[PDB]
Amino acid sequence: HLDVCAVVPAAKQYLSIGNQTILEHSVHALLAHPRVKRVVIAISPGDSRFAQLPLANHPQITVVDGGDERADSVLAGLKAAGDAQWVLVHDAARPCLHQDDLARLLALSETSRTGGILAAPVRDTMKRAEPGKNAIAHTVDRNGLWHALTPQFFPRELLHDCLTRALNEGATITDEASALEYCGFHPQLVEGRADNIKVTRPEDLALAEFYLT
Amino acid sequence: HLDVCAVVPAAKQYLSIGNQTILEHSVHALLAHPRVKRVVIAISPGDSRFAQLPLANHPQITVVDGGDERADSVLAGLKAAGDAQWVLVHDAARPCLHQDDLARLLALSETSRTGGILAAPVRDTMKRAEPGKNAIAHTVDRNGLWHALTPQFFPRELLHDCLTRALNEGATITDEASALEYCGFHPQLVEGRADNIKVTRPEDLALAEFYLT
Ligand SMILES: [Ca+2]
Ligand SMILES: [Ca+2]
C-alpha cells in the first residue's frame, strides 16, 4: 500500500545551484521520503544532458521519453510506474520542496481516495481585469483562493484515466489536479510553504538559491 | 498639475534593513520621484518610534494621527494633502519599490481621470476551494488575474469621496482601488515588478533584504 512512484515531467531544469542541477535538487527532495521507491523522469528525445547526470545510473530512477505537452510526459511516466498504487507528480524546476510539506502531502493516501496537492493560500488582494484591457473589472475574493504547487499526489490509475479522458475530449488542462477536476473530482488542498517556487525566469534562479541556502 | 502628494498609512514597518527602517526605505522610494512634493505619514497615536527617525524633521514630510482601519488612516492623510490634484497611496511595509514602476504609474495622470495601481500578473495556477473545507471546487482562470500592489495613484478628491462613501455604506474595502470599484469606477492596471513585496511575516524581512540588496 505505502509504496509510491514519482513522475517528473522534464521534457531551466539544467541550471545549477551549488554544483547540483535544479533537476537533481528536485528529484533528491522526492527520494528523501522513504515511501518514494521510484522516480520516473520523462525527458525530451535528443536531451543529451540528463545522461551525463548521476541520476542516470541511480537504481531508483527510470528515464523515459516525454511528449509535446505536460500531460503527455506525465502519461509516459505513468507507463513505467510499475504497480504503484499512488503516484507523486512533481515539477522538474521546483528545487525548494521541503520534507515536512512532502510528508503531509503523502498522508493523503490514508484519508483520501482522490488525492490532493500542495498549495499556498493567496495573500495579496486580487483583481480581475476587464476582457481585452488593463482596467480593473472587480476584486476577486482571495478567501478560499489558493496557489497550486507541486507535488500533486493521486491514485495512479485514476490519474491515468482522468488525464487520458481530459486530453481525448480536448479539455483545457493546466496541472494534474485540473484533469481530476474535469472528470468531476475535487482533490484536497494541503497547505505548503510559499518558498516552493518554480524556476522559470532568469531572476528565479537567484531567488531559489536564496530559499535553498 | 504635475504636483503629487503621497500618503502612507503607517498606523514590521520599524524593522530595519541596512541601518535604515522599512518605513524609511518605503518613503525614500516615493521621494525619489521629482513629482512627489509631499509625503503624509499617518501614525498611530502613542507611536513613539517615528519621532526618533530622520523623517520626522524632513521638510517634505508631514505626520498625522492615523485611525483604526486602513481607510481611516488614508482619509486622515488626505486632510493634510494640501491642494494636490493627485495622490499616491503606498504601503509602509513595501520597501522594494523601484523607480521605473513608480514612473510608469505616475504617467496615468496624463492619460486617465480615474487613476490606477501597480500590479503583477498571476503566474501560478489558481484553485478555488469549496466553501468550508480544503477541497478544490475548481480552477480559477489566471488569465486577466492580477496581484494588486502599491502605490495606488488616484485623483485626490475622487479618492476621498469614494473611500468616504464606501465606509459610510459599510462596504467591504481592501485596497484603495476597491473603494473606487465600489463606486462604479475601474482603475487602470500598470504592470510592476513582482519583487515589490510587503513585509508582513518574519521571513519577509530576509527576502526584502535580498531583493533590495
Ligand atoms: Ca530514499
Ligand atoms: Ca525628491
d(CA A147, CA B129): 11
Q: Where are the beta strands (DSSP E) in chain B?
A: 4-10, 36-43, 61-65, 86-89, 116-121, 126-129, 136-140, 145-155, 188-191
CB contact at 8 A, B190 and B119: yes
Q: Do B144 and A136 touch (CB under 8 A)?
A: no
Solved how? Answer: X-ray
Helix B202-212, helix A202-212: angle, nearest 10: 140
d(CA B72, CA A5): 54
User: Which has the closest alpha carbon to B107: B118, B122, B92, B119?
Assistant: B118
Contacts of B128 in chain A (CB under 8 A): 144-146
Locate A38 and state its grid cell: 521510484
d(CA A174, CA B80): 49
Q: Is A103 on the interface with B (CB under 8 A)?
A: no
Q: For B115, left (φ over 0), alpha (ψ -120 to 50), or beta?
A: left
- CA dihedral sign, ordered B29, B33, B34, B36: negative
Resolution in Å, one decimal place: 1.5
d(CA B48, CA B59): 20
CB contact at 8 A, A6 and A38: yes
Which residue shows C-alpha cell 534562479?
A205
CB contact at 8 A, A130 and A137: yes
* Number of neighbouring beta carbons within 10 Å of residue A114: 18
Helix B22-31, helix B202-212: angle, nearest 10: 40
Query: What is the SS3 assignment for B7?
Result: strand
CB contact at 8 A, A48 and A13: no
d(CA A137, CA B186): 6
- Rg, chain B, Cα only: 17
Report the residue from A123, A135, A148 with minimal CB separation from B127: A148
Alpha-carbon dihedral B192, B194, B199, B204, rounded to 10 degrees: -160
User: Which has the closest alpha carbon to B203: A27, A25, A98?
Assistant: A98
Q: Which of A12, A128, A136 to mutate: most B Cβ within 10 Å?
A: A136
d(CA A190, CA A120): 8
Alpha helices by DSSP H, listed for B80-149, are 99-106
CB contact at 8 A, A119 and A110: no
Helix A22-31, helix A202-212: angle, nearest 10: 40
Domains (ranges, CATH) in chain B?
A: 1-213 (3.90.550.10)
Q: Do B144 and A128 touch (CB under 8 A)?
A: yes
Q: Is B189 on the interface with A (CB under 8 A)?
A: yes
CB contact at 8 A, A23 and A15: no
State the DSSP H helix or E strand holding residue A209, giving kind and residue range, or none if neither: helix A202-212
Q: Do B187 and A135 touch (CB under 8 A)?
A: yes
